[PDB]
A paper describes a structure:
The full length mature HA1/HA2 trimer crystal structures are as follows: (1) A/Fort Monmouth/1/1947 solved at 2.95 Å resolution, (2) A/Jiangsu/ALS1/2011 solved at 2.35 Å resolution, (3) A/Almaty/32/1998 solved at 2.05 Å resolution, (4) A/Hickox/JY2/1940 solved at 1.95 Å resolution, (5) A/Netherlands/002P1/1951 solved at 2.5 Å resolution, and (6) A/Melbourne/1/1946 solved at 2.55 Å resolution. In addition, we also solved a 2.0 Å resolution crystal structure of the refolded head of A/Fort Monmouth/1/1947, which appears quite similar to the lower resolution full length mature trimer structure. The antibody C05 Fab failed to bind many of our other IVA HAs, as examined by analytical size exclusion chromatography. Failure to bind correlated with an insertion in HA between 146R-G147 of the epitope, whereas sequences without an insertion bound the antibody. Our other IVA HA structures all contain an insertion near the C05 Fab CDR3 binding site that appears to prevent antibody binding, via either insertion of an Asn which becomes glycosylated to physically block C05 binding, or insertion of an Arg, Lys, or Ile into the C05 binding pocket. Although the insertion of either a glycosylated residue observed in the electron density of our structures (A/Netherlands/002P1/1951 and A/Fort Monmouth/1/1947) or of a bulky side chain which partially changes the loop conformation (A/Jiangsu/ALSI/2011, A/Almaty/32/1998, A/Hickox/JY2/1940, and A/Melbourne/1/1946) appears consistent with the loss of C05 antibody Fab binding by analytical SEC, rigorous mutational analysis and quantitative binding experiments would be required to prove these are evasion mechanisms. It is possible, for example, that the glycosylation could be accommodated by movement of the positioning of the antibody as was the case for the S245N glycosylation site of H3N2 viral neuraminidases with IG01 antibodies (Ref PubMed ID 36543789).
Author numbering:
A (entry chain E), E (entry chain A), F (entry chain D): 2 to 324
B (entry chain e), C (entry chain a), D (entry chain d): 330 to 489
Write the structure that this text describes.
C-alpha cells in the first residue's frame, strides 16, 4: 500500500538557544547577535592612526617633558591612546588649568604642526634664556626643562618688562601654552626676577587674564618646594596673543597649529598597534561592528555596537533539532 | 508546540531530508525517497532572513567616544556620567535579552505553523481518498504512482 | 499566513464586501449578495483599536527643553549631553522600528486567526449537510433559502 | 480566542477541575468526574514560570545613587540631570507598560493553544468511534468503561 | 446547488507597511505613528508666546545694546527664540560671566518688568553721567552706550568713592547687571577715574565679590583695546544690594523684576512668529504632539513625541489587500 | 451513551490584567511586577546604617555648628540622611566652597575619625583663642562658635605671622576645613588683626591657594555684616598641609581622617530609623528590590528596580476565568 508523510528538517547541530518558555533548546541553525571578542590591537578609525603616548601623558607630551618624543611632521590622529605606564607629565610641580578640557579637545585632530612661536635665540635679547633649568626635569643626569617652554630669568641684574605678541598667520587654530612660576621665598623671587611684585599678563581677543605670583613655603614635590601653574588657550585665525610680563613668566617657545576634529576620546591601553582598520575601538582592542551588541567593554570609541552585560545572545533560524 | 505539529503529532525530524526545512516522504510501488517542499521552505528562508537582518540592520549608531574624564572637584559630573552609561547598559541588556527570548519562541512557532499548514494543505487535497494515520502520514487507498505523488506536492492533485 | 486562512485556503479577498472586515457570500435560488459578520468584525475593530491606542497613549511625556548651551571650556559637558541625546535617539529609533515590525506581523496574524475561526464556526454548525470545497465555501446538500442563510450567519442553524 | 478554543467552541471553565489547568470530564456507566491532564499542564506550568522568571531575573541592576545636587549657578547641569532621569523614566514606563500588555496577550493565546492541541489529540485518537459534539465533548458510539477512558487520557486508545 | 462562503475585506487601498517577515506589504487600512511635518512657525507653548529677539542675542538684549528693541510693558514668555542674524551682543568687548547660565534661567519667565533701579539723573550727583559713550556702541552714527547701564566717569578732576544701595521692595527676584571697566593703558585709567588703583565691590546677602581693574594693552575689538567684564546676580525679595566703587564701575541703570518659570530653553530659528498654539516647538516650526514619534529635529521644547531617525512608522489595522 | 469532554480550569479568582486587545480581563492566577509600597523606614544599605543628621545639614555638621550632636566614636555610613527640618548650617554668613561636591564625597565612608589636628590650647601660643565667639553662632544663650574651627585674634596688641604644619600620619585621607573672615569695616579689621592688609595661605602638595580679605559694608545676615568663607581640601596620606597667615584665618581645630567608599548619595526624609536591612532606599522608606519595577520614588539609592510612572503591571499566569 502507498503512503505519503509530512515532516521537517533535522541536522547534526548541537546549537542551543533560549526561548521564553524553555531554556537550552537544541536547534538546527542559528545566528549570533553578540560580539564576543577583540583583536588585542589598536587600529585606525576613519583610516587615521591614533596618537600613542608611551612614557608620557598628554600633559607632559604637550609641554615637552624631556622624556617624551617630539612630533617632527604634520601629524593627525583619530584618538589618543596612553599606556598604563604613562607617568611623565609635569616634572615641575604645579596646577595644569583645565587639563581634562584640553585632553578632550586634543583627542582628535586632522592637522598638527609644532612651530617656534617665540624663538629662544632671538626673541628675548634683554633676558637670560639659559638659567631656566631644574633638577626636577632632569634628563640623562643633567638638569633640563620642557622642550616647548622657556624659563626667562634676570640678566645683568634686571628683569625688564617684556611685551611679545604673536599673530596667527596660520589658517587654523594655534594652541599656545605657558606657565607662571611661584617661588618659595622672597629671596628666590629677588634672585630670579629682581623684584618682589611681578605680574604676568596674557591677552587676546577672547582671552584676558593677569597672573600674580603667590610666594609661600610649601612641601617639596619632585624635590621642589615652589610651584609653577600651567595655562593654555586656543588662538583663532587672524587673532593676536600678547604676553606682557614683569617676571615669573614661563614663556612659550613652541606652539601647535591644529585643526580639531569631531570629538573623540582617550583609551588607556597597554595593547600594541597594528596596520588595521576598524569602526570600533575598545581599550583591549578593536572589535567587529557588524553585530548589534558587544560585551567586550562599555568604554568604546567609534561607530560601535551597544554594550551589554550578556554572555549569550543568538537567534534561532532553523527548527528544533529532533533526530 | 504552539500549532501542535512539531512537538506534537509529527514526533520527529528527518535527517534524510537535506534539501530543505519542510518536505515529504513518499512510499509507493515505484520507489521511495525524501523530497523537500521548496515552496514552503523558501518563504521561511525569506522571512527568517528578513527577520534576522531587521534585528541587525535596524541598529543606527553614530560616531561616539563613550569615555569622559573628570577631576577631583567634578565627582558629581563623574557620577552623572556613570548613571548615563549604566542606564543605557541596563536598558540595552534587558531589551536585547528579552528580544532574543521572545522572538526565538516566535521563530519556532513560525516553523510549527508552516509545518501545520503543509499537513493541512495535503489533507484538503486528499479530502478522503486516504486515511490519516495521525502521525503526519497518509496511507493511500489507491495506487498513487510517482506522477500522483508529485501532483500532491505540486498542489494539483486530481480528486478521483 | 500563520493560521493558513488568508494567504491560504481562502486565496483572495472580496472587494464586493464593503460592510465589514469578515463576512459571507451566499448563493441560492432566492438571490446572491455579500454580507459582513458584524459580531466578528466588531471584536477585531475593538481589539485593533485598543492595540493602536496602547502604542500611542501609553507614551507618557513630560515638559522638557532638550537644548543645552556650553562654552569653549565645557566641551566635555557638551559631549556628555550629545551622548545623552544620541543614546535616547538610538533606543527610541531601535525600539520603535522593531515595535512596528513585530506588532504588524501580529496584527496580520490576528486577522488570519479571526478568519479561520469564522470559517470553523460555520463548519461546526453545518456538520455534514454541506461539502467543504476547501476554498472557504460550503456546497449545501439541502435547499437553504434566505431564512436558512440568515440563520447560518446569525448562528442559529437547525441541524435536521 | 486566537486558536478558537477558550473564548470559542469550549465556552467556559470548570470550577470542578481543581487538579490542574487543562483536563477532561468523562461520563460513563461507572461514574463521572473531573481529571486534569498533568502531562500538558505541567509543560505549561513549567513554561509560564520560566517566562515569568526570565522577565524578573534578567533585570541586571548595579548600585546607584540617582540624585545629584547642584547650586544656583549649575542649573544647566541640574536640567541635564533632569533630562537623564526623565529620559530613563519615559523608556522604562513605555517598555514596561507595553511588555506586560503584549506578553499577557501571548500567555492567554498560549493557554488557548494548549487546550486546542489537547482537544485535537483526542479527536485524532477517537477518529470516528465517537460523534464530535462541537462543544469540546465526544459522545462515544460504543460503551467506554474506565479502562477505555484512562487509555484516552494516557494516549493509548486502541482503534478496534 | 446553493452555497455559503467565508471571506474577508478588500479595497482599492495602496497603503504599504513593513512586517518582521516581509517588507512593503499592501494593506487595507493603517494608522501613522511618526510625526513627519511642521508648520514653519514659532508658536506659543502653554498658550504663552515666546520672546523673539531680532537683531540682538540674549547678551545684547538684556544689557541694552543700542540696536535692540526695549520692552515697554510687563511681559512673559515660555521660551526664547533668536535669529541666525542675531549678531548684536556686547558692543563693547569683554567677558560675560556665566552667560550660558543666565540664558538658561531667563529662558521662561512668568512676569518680567524693566525698571530704573538707579535713576541716572539723580543717583550720581558727584560723578559724570554724560561722558560714558563709545564708538563701539554707536547708534545712528553718533556715539552711544547700553540703555540699561551707566558708564560713570570723573568730574572736576576727581572720582570719589560711591556707595549706592537698592532694597528689593518688589515681591519677586530682581536681576541686577553691572560692569567693570578695564582700560588699555594707565593714561586712560587716570583720565577716566583719577586714580591708579581703584576697586569695585558688589555685595548682597548671598553675593560677595570685589573687582580690581586689570590695565593692559589688548588687541582691538570693535576698535576698543580696553574691555568691560559683565556680571549679574538674582536679588531675592527683601534683600539689599550695595555697590561700592573707586572707579571703573559700569553701574546698573535699569534692572528687572522677574519670576522664573519651569525651566525652558532657547531655539535658533529663521522661521517667523505666528499666532498659533502648539504643545511641541521645533526650531524649524511647530509640530503636532499626538503621535508618539517625530523625525523633525532632536532639539525640541514642550511635551514632545520622542525623536527617532525613522522615515516610516505606521501600524496596520486592516488586512492584506488582495483584490 | 458515554462521553468525554475537554475543558480548562476556572476558580473564584477576581484578578484582572490588561492585554493589548482587551482591557480588564479577569484571570485565574497572576503575578505582580510593580513594587507598590514601602515600609516608611530608613534601613541599612550594605549592612551599614546611614548617617542621620537632625537639626543640621552637612555644612553645619561637618563644621561643628553649635547646635549639632557630635559622634566622638569612629564611625562609618552607607548614605547620609537629613531631615526637611535641617536648617542649621553656617551660622556665620559666608560662602562654602564646593559644598555640593563635598556633600557628594562624604555621602559614603567606610571609616571616619574626628581628631584634634591643631590642639586649640598649644598650637597658637602668640594669638588669642578665647575671643573667637560670636552672637551669630549662639548656644544656650551665650555666644559660641564652630566646634571644629578656631577664630584666631590678636593678643597684647599684635597679630604675628604664623606657620603651622600638619603631616598626615594617618593611613587614609584627612579632610581639612578652614575659613577666612572678611570684616565689615576697616576699624573692626584693625581691632581683630592689627593690620589693614593681611593674607591667608594654605598649601599642600596638590593644593595652592592664597586668600586676601575683602573689607566692605554688607547687609547683615544673622545679625552679622561681615562674612566668613569656608574652604576644604582632602589631604592625601603622607602629605603635609601648611597654614601661613597674617590675620583673618579661621584656623582648623578638628579634622577628619576618613576613607571614602563607592559613591552613595543623600536622601531628605521625614522617615524614622529602624533596625532593618534593605537593598534599596527611597526617601519615603525602604522597598523590596525583587520586582523589576517600582513606582514609589524616582530618586533611590542601591540596587533598585527601575522607576515607572505606572500604577498596575501584572502578568497573567493562569487562564481567563470563565465560570
Ligand atoms: C619620568 O617618570 C619616571 C618614573 O616615574 C621618574 O622617575 C622616578 O623619579 C622619582 C623621583 O620623584 C623616584 O622616586 C624618588 O627616589 C628618591 C631617591 O631615593 C627618593 O628620595 C624619593 O623619596 C621622596 O618621595 C617619597 C615618596 O613617599 C618620600 O617617602 C621620601 O621621603 C622623599 O620625599 C622627600 O623628603 C625630603 C624632605 O623631608 C626631601 O629632602 C627628599 O629629597 C624627598 O624629595 C622618591 O622615592 C622614582 O624612583 C623614579 N622612578 C624611576 C622608574 O626612575 C622620572 O623622574 C620622570 N621624569 C620626568 C622628567 O618627569
Ligand atoms: C539653627 O536653626 C534654627 C532654625 O532652624 C535657627 O533659629 C531661627 O533663627 C532665625 C534667625 O535668627 C530666627 O528668626 C529671627 O527672629 C527674630 C525675632 O526673634 C527676627 O527679628 C528676625 O527677623 C529678621 O529676619 C527676617 C527674615 O524674614 C527679616 O524680614 C527681618 O527684617 C529681620 O531682618 C533684620 O535683620 C537683618 C540682620 O539679621 C537686617 O539686615 C535687616 O535689615 C533687618 O533689620 C528673624 O526672623 C528664628 O526665630 C529662629 N527660630 C528658632 C525656632 O529658633 C537658629 O538660629 C540656628 N542656630 C544656629 C547656631 O545656626
Ligand atoms: C550690530 O551688528 C552689525 C552687524 O555685525 C554691526 O555692523 C557691523 O559693524 C562692523 C564693525 O563694528 C563692520 O565690520 C567692519 O567694516 C568696516 C567697514 O564697513 C571695516 O573698516 C572693518 O575692518 C570691519 O570689517 C560690519 O561690516 C558691519 N556690518 C553691517 C551689516 O553693518 C553693528 O556695528 C552692530 N551694532 C552694535 C551696536 O553692536
Ligand atoms: C644666565 O645665567 C647663568 C647662570 O646659571 C649664566 O651661566 C653661568 O655663567 C657664569 C659666568 O658667566 C659661570 O661661572 C657659571 O658656571 C655659569 N653657570 C651655568 C649653569 O652655565 C649665564 O652666563 C647667563 N647668561 C646670560 C646671557 O646672562
Ligand atoms: C562730563 O563730560 C562731558 C564730556 O566730556 C563734559 O562736557 C564737555 O565740556 C567741555 C567743557 O566746556 C566742552 O568743551 C565739551 O564740548 C563738552 N562735551 C560735550 C560732548 O558736550 C561735561 O562738562 C562733564 N561734566 C558734566 C557735569 O557733565
Ligand atoms: C583674649 O581675649 C579675651 C576677650 O577679649 C580677653 O578677656 C577679656 O578681658 C577683659 C579685661 O581683662 C574682660 O573685661 C573680659 O570680660 C574678658 N573676656 C573674656 C571672654 O574672658 C583675654 O584677656 C584675652 N587674652 C589674651 C591672652 O589676649
Ligand atoms: C543543554 O543541553 C545539553 C544537551 O546535551 C547539555 O549537554 C548542556 O549541558 C545543557 N546546558 C545547560 C546550560 O543546561
Ligand atoms: C650691565 O649694566 C652695567 C651698569 O653700569 C653696564 O655698565 C653694562 O654695560 C651692562 N651690561 C650689558 C651686557 O648690558
Ligand atoms: C512596493 O511594492 C509595489 C508593488 O506593486 C511596487 O510597485 C513599489 O515600487 C514598491 N515600493 C517602492 C518604494 O518601490
Ligand atoms: C474591571 O472589571 C470589574 C468587573 O469585572 C469592575 O468591577 C471594575 O470596576 C473594572 N475596572 C476598570 C478599571 O474598568
Amino acid at each position: 500500500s502507498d503512503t505519503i508523510c509530512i515532516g521537517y528538517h533535522a541536522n547534526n547541530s548541537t546549537d542551543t538557544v533560549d526561548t521564553v518558555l524553555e531554556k537550552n533548546v537544541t536547534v538546527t541553525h542559528s545566528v549570533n547577535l553578540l560580539e564576543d571578542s577583540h583583536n588585542g590591537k589598536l587600529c585606525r578609525l576613519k583610516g587615521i592612526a591614533p596618537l600613542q603616548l608611551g612614557k608620557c601623558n598628554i600633559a607632559g607630551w604637550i609641554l615637552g617633558n624631556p622624556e617624551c618624543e617630539s612630533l617632527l611632521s604634520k601629524r593627525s590622529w583619530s584618538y589618543i591612546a596612553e599606556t598604563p605606564n604613562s607617568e611623565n607629565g609635569t616634572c615641575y610641580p604645579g596646577d595644569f588649568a583645565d587639563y581634562e578640557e584640553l585632553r578632550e579637545q586634543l583627542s582628535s585632530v586632522s592637522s598638527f604642526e609644532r612651530f617656534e612661536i617665540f624663538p629662544k635665540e632671538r626673541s628675548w635679547p634683554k633676558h637670560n634664556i639659559t638659567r631656566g633649568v631644574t633638577a626636577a626635569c632632569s634628563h640623562a643626569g643633567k638638569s633640563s626643562f620642557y622642550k616647548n617652554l622657556l624659563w626667562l630669568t634676570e640678566t645683568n641684574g634686571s628683569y625688564p618688562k617684556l611685551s611679545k605678541s604673536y599673530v596667527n598667520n596660520k589658517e587654523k587654530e594655534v594652541l599656545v601654552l605657558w606657565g607662571v612660576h611661584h617661588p618659595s621665598n622672597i629671596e628666590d623671587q629677588k634672585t630670579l626676577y629682581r623684584k618682589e611684585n611681578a605680574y604676568v599678563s596674557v591677552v587676546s581677543s577672547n582671552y584676558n587674564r593677569r597672573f600674580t605670583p603667590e610666594i609661600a613655603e610649601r612641601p617639596k614635590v619632585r624635590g621642589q618646594a615652589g610651584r609653577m601653574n600651567y595655562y593654555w588657550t586656543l588662538l583663532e585665525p587672524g587673532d593676536t596673543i600678547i604676553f606682557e610680563a614683569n617676571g615669573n613668566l614661563i614663556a612659550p617657545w613652541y606652539a601647535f597649529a591644529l585643526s580639531r576634529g569631531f570629538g573623540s576620546g582617550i583609551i588607556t591601553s597597554n595593547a600594541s598597534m597594528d596596520e588595521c582598520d576598524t569602526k570600533c575601538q575598545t581599550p583591549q582592542g578593536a572589535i567587529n561592528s557588524s553585530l548589534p551588541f558587544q560585551n567586550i567593554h562599555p568604554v568604546t570609541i567609534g561607530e560601535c555596537p551597544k554594550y551589554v552585560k550578556s554572555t549569550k545572545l543568538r537567534m534561532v533560524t532553523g527548527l528544533r533539532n529532533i533526530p | 508546540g504552539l500549532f501542535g505539529a512539531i512537538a506534537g503529532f509529527i514526533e520527529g525530524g528527518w535527517t534524510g531530508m537535506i534539501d530543505g526545512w519542510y518536505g515529504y516522504h513518499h512510499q509507493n510501488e515505484q520507489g521511495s525517497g525524501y523530497a523537500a517542499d521548496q515552496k514552503s521552505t523558501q518563504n521561511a528562508i525569506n522571512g527568517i532572513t528578513n527577520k534576522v537582518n531587521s534585528v541587525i540592520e535596524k541598529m543606527n549608531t553614530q560616531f561616539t567616544a563613550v569615555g569622559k574624564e573628570f577631576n577631583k572637584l567634578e565627582k558629581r559630573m563623574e557620577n552623572l556620567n556613570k548613571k548615563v552609561d549604566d542606564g543605557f547598559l541596563d536598558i540595552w541588556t534587558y531589551n536585547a535579552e528579552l528580544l532574543v527570548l521572545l522572538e526565538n519562541e516566535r521563530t519556532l512557532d513560525f516553523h510549527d505553523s508552516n509545518v501545520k499548514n503543509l499537513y493541512e494543505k495535503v489533507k484538503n487535497q486528499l479530502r478522503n481518498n486516504a486515511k490519516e494515520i495521525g502521525n503526519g502520514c497518509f496511507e493511500f487507498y489507491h495506487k498513487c504512482n510517482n506522477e500522483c505523488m508529485e501532483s500532491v506536492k505540486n498542489g494539483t492533485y486530481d480528486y478521483p
